[PDB]
Design a protein around this nucleic acid. Structure first.
Ligand SMILES: [K+]
Ligand SMILES: [K+]
Ligand SMILES: [K+]
Ligand SMILES: [K+]
Ligand SMILES: [K+]
Ligand SMILES: [K+]
Ligand SMILES: [K+]
Ligand SMILES: [K+]
Ligand SMILES: [K+]
Ligand SMILES: [K+]
Ligand SMILES: [K+]
Ligand SMILES: [Mg+2]
Ligand SMILES: [Mg+2]
Ligand SMILES: [Mg+2]
Ligand SMILES: [Mg+2]
Ligand SMILES: [Mg+2]
Ligand SMILES: [Mg+2]
Ligand SMILES: [Mg+2]
Ligand SMILES: [Mg+2]
Ligand SMILES: [Mg+2]
Ligand SMILES: [Mg+2]
Ligand SMILES: [Mg+2]
Ligand SMILES: [Mg+2]
Ligand SMILES: [Mg+2]
Ligand SMILES: [Mg+2]
Ligand SMILES: [Mg+2]
Ligand SMILES: [Mg+2]
Ligand SMILES: [Mg+2]
Ligand SMILES: [Mg+2]
Ligand SMILES: [Mg+2]
Ligand SMILES: [Mg+2]
Ligand SMILES: [Mg+2]
Ligand SMILES: [Mg+2]
Ligand SMILES: [Mg+2]
Ligand SMILES: [Mg+2]
Ligand SMILES: [Mg+2]
Ligand SMILES: [Mg+2]
Ligand SMILES: [Mg+2]
Ligand SMILES: [Mg+2]
Ligand SMILES: [Mg+2]
Lengths: 261, 147, 184
RNA sequence: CCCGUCGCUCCUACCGAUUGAAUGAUCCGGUGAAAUGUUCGGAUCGCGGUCGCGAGAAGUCCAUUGAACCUUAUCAUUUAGAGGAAGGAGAAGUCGUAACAAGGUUUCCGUAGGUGAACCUGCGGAAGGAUCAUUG
RNA sequence: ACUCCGCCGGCACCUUAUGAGAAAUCAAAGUUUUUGGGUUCCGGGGGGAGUAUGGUCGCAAGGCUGAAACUUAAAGGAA
RNA sequence: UGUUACUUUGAAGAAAUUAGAGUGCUCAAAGCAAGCCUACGCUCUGUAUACAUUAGCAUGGGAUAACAUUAUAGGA
RNA sequence: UACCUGGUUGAUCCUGCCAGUAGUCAUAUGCUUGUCUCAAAGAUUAAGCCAUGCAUGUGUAAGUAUGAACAAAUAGACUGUGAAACUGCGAAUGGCUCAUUAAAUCAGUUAUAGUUUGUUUGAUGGUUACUCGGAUAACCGUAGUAAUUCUAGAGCUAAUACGUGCACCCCGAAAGGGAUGCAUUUAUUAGAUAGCGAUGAUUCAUGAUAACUCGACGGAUCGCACGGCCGCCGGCGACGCAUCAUUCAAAUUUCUGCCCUAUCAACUUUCGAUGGUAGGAUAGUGGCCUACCAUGGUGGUGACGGGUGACGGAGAAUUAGGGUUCGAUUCCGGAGAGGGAGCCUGAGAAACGGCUA
């Protein structure tokens, strides 16, 4: 190509969007924004495919152009705005407020929130370094830059960000014993306690996570996101609570549901 | 001395005409010879910390970082100036016959004056940025043949 | 035009490379500046990749030169190119390139030396000048060329890239090395 | 049952004087458009005090990149060729009878010479021989 | 020197199948659909043909390397 | 801290296709839907999972096998 | 479905092939054809040649209206709508095709501490001015040419167009003066230890200092709403400039992996072949290029050369297992726009529904 690609073929779109292959030749091309295009959920998918408020591509534009949808407390009018993990989506007219969290099968779930819990979000710290004039700053994995951070905050820590004051309220150091969620790979959406950190000089660092039921799984440091200090997350989790069930166990529940339901 | 080229060879950033003395200052400051550790558990040879050679492609006293793949092999050619050919021997799996065949690859690598090498010696090479048309590796350790 | 691609080169084995695509704009080169010493200063502005700017100096006469041991930098006139390690033909053409040995006017540094040490090469003022004179040392080789009004200097900038000819005054064993190259 | 020359028809390929031919590609060399950079140039325009300042076209100079064309050379592919000559096919040609029986000179291998043709002969070898056998 | 017993090595022969094989036959040509000790060379219907061409060796005779077009429903082994 | 192969487990790995779970498009090839009751709705509805040579990355194993090494020990 | 049958003999058992049998998201062709669902379709030969039409334009309350425009009103700059035109942006995506290309493309796997990146998102930008200047389009009216979104001259007038412009250290009779935003270029200096940040690893992030540059930088812009103090102050937005991070990406790059051919055994190196030093050029690494120096680099583990009716992969057909064959084509990557070459604009093109030869 001679420059930037503006189209996304439907079969090349991320699988966790769950787009039907015969729905059309194209999928929404995620706009540039805080999250990567492969780890986001464009507002058009949320409003039309997940919430059913819009029936067509055109109707999503009407909803957004009325300024009825907000992401992280700010109105967004871009149809392909890349809303991602921990983002807070608010729709004042419907009095609804959701947090984008992965279900245990690795797909984004619109977790309904209470009005009180919709005033903050969690962010993972990418790095901390000195800026111009020797002023320290930290940047996150959701594209945010915070100047004058607490000197104790380091890379891979999690910060609680208030969407009103736009300031760091509290932070969690990345250490063994905290509850974390997996944000990428095979184990995406699984919640457990960080049990070990295996460092390899020059290579990726591996982290061993143990589920509440004793199931242990590994992953890369880049796919970990601390949710709370100790064992209690600072955010509300969906029903599964990051517990991944075997297909045999899942089939057992389905069989029982038909007997009762 | 090491001044054998048409230009005067020196390390960048090491000021040699300072009125003050370099006694009690870190390498590369106060006119002291500059050297560094490359990490990954490799040791800085004594010949590079106390040497007088100038090599901007040296991994310990030059301006090149080691990052990427660390490979090992045997010195195949040591006839170039500060460059050797490293032969890497490996087995290629032939699927249909469920057997192996011996293959090899010649990897050019830069060798700093702090290392002594001869054909047949075992060498470890670390990847660096392109240093020439073919060289992408720097010698990090030499084990004499028969040791 | 000028290209920096490897497609025209031979393989490391020696075999030829058959062409499989046309030249790309993102691998181009450009004509050398060939900066010369001349009082008719000329620097042309070049638009480069990303919309950024390079300054190509065709002719220069002054430069910003630093006396390292004294930690003083002054703008001074470039007088002559005397030595070039790459190509002696760049010396007689008076081409300004990085690492070329040139002679610069010593007048701006003499004024600072007289204003700083009170020496040629107000009660509270004389108090400090004599205080600074205790730790004053001047290389004999460096002082010998102040009489002629010219200092040997090395260009540390790239005039064809930044449009300027900056450098530092030679001293120490570097000065000895080059003055031996000029001793003929 | 069977071998070859010779004679007739057709098919495939080969050799071949022609310094064969055609087509394509490549090397070297020659010439060289255009563009770009540089040098000079200063039509013209503007702005100050009939002199300055700035901008600047045509054109020109050197260099770079370099199409294109024209040689010689090489390679590739296709193709004509007097004549020479091979193989195969073609119910029911001529001359013999070489191989099959000890095939009427046992056959065969290597090599050499010779003869219309199969073949013949010399030398050494093999049995796949027509002898597994003479302490007679 | 000869006679008797035995050991190792060699050229062979005789009987036999519990073996193998299309059989002739083979104590290896056995220990193979119950398929694998190691390794080199080499064959893929009959012709065209060990021919043409190129290379290489030879003083030559020729040797080594070695096709295709085309043709054919058999040719061949043992009994 | 001699270097490897091999083996185990794991991470990373495009989708579509292939295998495969769920689902009565009337069946089917398919599709990724739908289902539940009858309210101003519900099931957080579903859109699983496996496979994926070789090379590379990381744990456990050390039989088999390769290379290297050994007595003027430059030995511990 | 882990399968065979006819054919050499008078008959027999073999070797061995010929023929038959079945499939192909496999093409063509023949004959035949009522209904439902689904669906490929000028790739193969000619990346041969193309008539005609169409395939890229674009307007918000928010850059610029005096149409001699419309509508509705009735001493005011304008302030209902708005053609045209300037300005801005886009046209580098998409679509098409498979010609060239055999460690090349490409695949998995790396690296950028080796770079650029309009936009999005986050953060960050010092202690005549009650607002400057000259042009030009539309329009207007003299035209030229057989002729083209071919073209000349004259009269007008705008801006978010164009050009401008308010906007600690040193010297020192401690007065006074110099420098003093951000960026640019060079040099000196700090960046410890085990006040003082990060990495497996950087004289790294970043600080201070001496100067440097004839710096498209640091708002002469627009909409809506009107309020609060006694002229002053002030709301919510739009657009734009610069820096860092982020996102969207590219470029280059590590390791391993590709079909047939030896009737291809040596190839490369004067004119770059392999490496070194110093430069030049580039967004940046690099013989990428120049000067000088060294004599290297590859090869029966098949270099080099030749063939391909060769784009690579995801995959496709058939498959007891192993395997054989195919892969122009809708997903990904690359490449090209009749053949070459060159280039402008731009964040991005060596662009072809752009230009030059
Ligand atoms: K590209
Ligand atoms: K006879
Ligand atoms: K006979
Ligand atoms: K005879
Ligand atoms: K015996
Ligand atoms: K554009
Ligand atoms: K790759
Ligand atoms: K490949
Ligand atoms: K470069
Ligand atoms: K070099
Ligand atoms: K642009
Ligand atoms: Mg495209
Ligand atoms: Mg790293
Ligand atoms: Mg007879
Ligand atoms: Mg007779
Ligand atoms: Mg006879
Ligand atoms: Mg017997
Ligand atoms: Mg067998
Ligand atoms: Mg045969
Ligand atoms: Mg079979
Ligand atoms: Mg019969
Ligand atoms: Mg058949
Ligand atoms: Mg009907
Ligand atoms: Mg326009
Ligand atoms: Mg080839
Ligand atoms: Mg490779
Ligand atoms: Mg620094
Ligand atoms: Mg260089
Ligand atoms: Mg040279
Ligand atoms: Mg293919
Ligand atoms: Mg092709
Ligand atoms: Mg393909
Ligand atoms: Mg083709
Ligand atoms: Mg097509
Ligand atoms: Mg494609
Ligand atoms: Mg192109
Ligand atoms: Mg065409
Ligand atoms: Mg073009
Ligand atoms: Mg077209
Ligand atoms: Mg196009």
């Amino acid at each position: 190509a001679r420059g930037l690609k503006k189209h996304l073929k439907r079969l090349n779109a991320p699988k966790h969007w769950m787009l039907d292959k015969l729905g059309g030749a194209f999928a929404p091309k995620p706009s540039s924004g805080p999250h990567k295009s492969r780890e986001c959920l464009p507002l058009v998918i949320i409003l039309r495919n997940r919430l059913k408020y819009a029936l067509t591509y055109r109707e999503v534009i009407s909803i957004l152009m009325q300024r009825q949808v907000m992401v992280d407390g700010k109105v967004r009018t871009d149809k392909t705005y890349p809303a991602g993990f921990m983002d807070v989506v608010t729709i004042p007219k419907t009095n609804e407020s959701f947090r984008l969290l992965y279900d245990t099968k690795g797909r984004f779930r619109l977790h309904s929130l209470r009005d009180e819990e919709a005033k903050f979000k969690l962010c993972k710290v990418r790095s901390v370094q000195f800026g111009q004039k020797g002023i320290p700053y930290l940047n996150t994995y959701d594209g945010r830059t915070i100047r004058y951070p607490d000197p104790l905050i380091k890379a891979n820590d999690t910060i609680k960000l208030d969407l009103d004051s736009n300031k760091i309220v509290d932070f969690i150091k990345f250490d063994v014993g905290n509850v974390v969620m997996v944000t990428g790979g095979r184990n995406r959406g699984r919640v457990g306690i960080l049990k070990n950190r295996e460092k390899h000089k020059g290579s990726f660092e591996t982290v061993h996570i143990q589920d509440s039921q004793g199931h242990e799984f590994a992953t890369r440091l880049g796919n970990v996101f601390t949710l709370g200090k100790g064992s209690k997350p600072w955010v509300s989790l969906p029903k599964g609570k990051g517990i991944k069930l075997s297909i045999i166990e899942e089939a057992r529940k389905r069989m029982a549901a038909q007997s009762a339901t | 001395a090491e001044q054998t080229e048409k230009a005067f060879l020196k390390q960048p950033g090491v000021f040699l005409s300072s009125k003050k003395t370099g006694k009690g200052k870190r390498p590369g400051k106060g006119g002291n010879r500059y050297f560094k550790s490359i990490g990954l558990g490799f040791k800085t040879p004594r010949e590079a910390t106390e040497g007088t050679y100038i090599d901007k492609k040296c991994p310990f006293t030059g301006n090149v970082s080691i990052r990427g793949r660390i490979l090992a092999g045997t010195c195949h050619s040591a006839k170039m100036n500060r460059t050797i050919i490293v032969r890497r021997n490996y087995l290629h799996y032939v699927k249909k016959y469920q057997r192996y065949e011996k293959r090899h690859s010649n990897i050019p690598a830069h060798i700093s004056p702090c290392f002594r090498v001869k054909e047949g010696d075992h060498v470890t090479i670390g990847q660096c940025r392109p240093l020439s048309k073919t060289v992408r590796f720097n010698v990090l350790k030499v084990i004499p043949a028969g040791s | 035009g000028i290209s920096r691609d490897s497609m025209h080169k031979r393989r490391a084995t020696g075999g030829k490379k058959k062409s499989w695509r046309k030249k790309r704009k993102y691998e181009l080169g450009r004509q050398p500046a060939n900066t010369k010493i001349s009082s008719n200063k000329t620097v042309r502005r070049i638009r480069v990749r990303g919309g950024n700017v390079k300054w190509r100096a065709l002719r220069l006469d002054t430069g910003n030169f630093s006396w390292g041991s004294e930690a003083v930098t002054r703008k001074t006139r470039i007088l002559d190119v005397v030595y070039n390690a790459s190509n002696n033909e760049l010396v007689r053409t008076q081409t300004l390139v990085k690492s070329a040995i040139v002679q610069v006017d010593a007048a701006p540094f003499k004024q600072w030396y007289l204003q700083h040490y009170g020496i040629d090469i107000s009660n509270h003022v004389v108090r400090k000048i004599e205080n600074r004179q205790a730790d004053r040392k001047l290389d004999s080789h460096l002082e010998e060329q102040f009489a002629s009004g010219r200092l040997l200097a090395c260009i540390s900038s790239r005039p064809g890239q930044c449009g300027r000819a900056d450098g530092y005054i030679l001293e120490g064993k570097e000065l000895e090395f080059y003055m031996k190259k000029l001793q003929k």
